Amino acid sequence: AIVATQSPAIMSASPGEKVTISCSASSSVSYMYWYQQKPGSSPKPWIYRTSNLASGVPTRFSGSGSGTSYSFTISSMEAEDAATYYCQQYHNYPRTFGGGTKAKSARADAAPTVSIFPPSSEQLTSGGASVVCFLNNFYPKDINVKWKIDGSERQNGVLNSWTDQDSKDSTYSMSSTLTLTKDEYERHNSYTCEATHKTSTSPIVKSFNRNEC
């Protein structure tokens, strides 16, 4: 009967920066919480009430608010901070969560390395055909891939998968796969994946002609 709305869905930050993460409730509560959740771990409680640290919480975390506003604050980010963090309300029935805020490490911008792969001969026995683009080792995570077949954009049949931010180099990588029927694949020659990313004023273009070598 109340929603909670938490302000950045994402959040890039560097160690030492002073992150702030807000929580906005659709009516006045005094009982909130901020959990923290690690990639392969339970949530843990970090704030309780609106400003109580839980025992075994670093004094780096603080919580403050009232009157529908509520605000986590991380006063000088550590590597071990990087996580999701999670408001609750526990002031009326259906206890609600927020949609979670995803604090991830950051670094200098890096352009993706893009490589395009026609369907393998083995897949083309199947009647399906997948064209794969890998977009590797880029930063920031925001990237958009547009596929074209003989000049015409194709949106249906595109599947994108992203790695988690790399634990050593802080980059992201992505696979973008265009799947079509083998019959359609052999009726066209040009296949293109175009990557829009802040590191270039125009997209990186990888393209091949099916019948060329």
Does position 117 bind another protein by CB under 8 A? no
Amino acid at 20: T
**Cα of 150 vs its chain's centroid, Å:** 31
Nearer to another protein, 90 or 117 (CB): 90
To another protein, the closest distance from the beta carbon of 51 in angstroms equals 8
Tokens, residue 165: 């931010």
To another protein, the closest distance from the beta carbon of 5 in angstroms equals 21
Nearer to another protein, 48 or 86 (CB): 48
- Segment 46-65, which members bind another protein (CB under 8 A)? 51
The stretch near another protein (CB under 8 A) out of 84-92, 125-133, 143-151, 194-202 is 84-92
Residue 201 DSSP label: S
Does position 208 bind another protein by CB under 8 A? no
Helical spans, DSSP H, in the chain: 182-185
Task: Print the binding letters for residues 9-48 with another protein: x by CB under 8 A, - otherwise.
Answer: ----------------------x-----------------
Separation CA 90–CA 95 (nearest Å): 5
Q: Which residue in 44, 91, 148, 210 binds another protein (CB under 8 A)?
A: 91
Contact 43, 34 (CB under 8 A): no
Does position 104 bind another protein by CB under 8 A? no
**Cα of 190 vs its chain's centroid, Å:** 31
Contact 20, 64 (CB under 8 A): no
Q: Which residue in 3, 7, 44, 90 binds another protein (CB under 8 A)?
A: 90
Give the residues across from 92 on adjacent strands: none
Residue 20 DSSP label: E
| Token pair 């175009």 in the structure block, residue | 194
Nearer to another protein, 92 or 144 (CB): 92
Site residues (vs another protein, CB under 8 A): 31, 51, 90-92
